[PDB]
């Protein structure tokens, strides 16, 4: 996160760390949606151009963490994965369209003050919240700068941007499965995800039932917090059907 702040403790209890067994490193962010399912970006697991193609045993998922580097001995839980599901039409060849995967934990995790699943948006929730000018929140342990690494979890609140602006800021083909968010060069506030925040949640709090919903997944960007450039996120609602379909296809 570029130009964020340290999250408070238990501020984002669904925030998952995707961790490499060996070398022992942060892969990406992720999110807990039930007691057995974690949502992330497919580009965290599979990116054939950078030779990235992770399997179930290459990976560990650490939930409840606050510190990026410390083993938070009695607060975080570290789980094993049984299976990884990538959207069958994740386009890594061109624009990371449908950048979404599901990970099934080997065992259900126990909810705690620090662990708790985020909700997935329903059509009606998607429809009234996903609107230009409304702010969402991104969290992660990613780089602080495009060009170091936080100690603690970082948060930043960003506006959703109009589709036309998104599009005219890049040369890349933007699909309906994406939204972009960030301040304009003119707004006088900045912030953005960055490498290592990838796969994390963009969430919004419903003003109607006071719940937190995950509207987007940290997907891609051109730099980190570059003027006239925006963060792009997978549109979780548009891919909901897929999400349901696999959890019921084997879950869940």
């Amino acid at each position: 996160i570029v130009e964020g702040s340290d999250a408070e403790i238990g501020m984002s209890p669904w925030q998952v760390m995707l961790f490499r067994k060996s070398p022992q490193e942060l892969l990406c962010g992720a999110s807990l949606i039930s007691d057995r399912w974690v949502l992330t970006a497919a580009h965290c697991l599979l990116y054939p151009p950078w030779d990235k193609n992770f399997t179930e045993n290459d990976l560990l998922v650490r939930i409840g963490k606050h510190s990026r580097t410390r083993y938070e001995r009695n607060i975080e839980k570290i789980s094993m994965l049984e299976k990884i599901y990538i959207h069958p039409r994740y386009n890594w060849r061109e624009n990371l369209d449908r950048d979404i995967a599901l990970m099934k934990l080997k065992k259900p995790v126990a909810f705690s003050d620090y662990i708790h699943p985020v909700c997935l948006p329903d059509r009606e929730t998607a429809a009234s919240l996903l609107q230009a000018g409304y702010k969402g929140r991104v969290t992660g342990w990613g780089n602080l700068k495009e060009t170091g690494q936080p100690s603690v979890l970082q948060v930043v609140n960003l506006p959703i941007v109009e589709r036309p602006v998104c599009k005219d800021s890049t040369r890349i083909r933007i699909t309906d499965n994406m939204f972009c968010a960030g301040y304009k060069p003119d707004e006088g506030k900045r912030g953005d995800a960055c490498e290592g925040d990838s796969g994390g949640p963009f969430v919004m709090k419903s003003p109607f039932n006071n719940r937190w919903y995950q509207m987007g997944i940290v997907s891609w960007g051109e730099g980190c917090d570059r003027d006239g450039k925006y963060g792009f996120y997978t549109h979780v609602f548009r891919l909901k059907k897929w999400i349901q379909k696999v959890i019921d296809q084997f879950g869940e």
Binding site: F111, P117, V118, L129, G136, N157, M204, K205, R211
Partner: peptide, 25 residues
């Protein structure tokens, strides 16, 4: 039970910048 944070919503405590989200809606 999704999206209600044990240390915030469940005790009716707000986090330091959630109202920035709310003011934008």
């Amino acid at each position: 039970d999704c999206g209600l944070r044990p240390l915030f919503e469940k005790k009716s405590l707000e986090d330091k910048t959630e109202r920035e989200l709310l003011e934008s809606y």
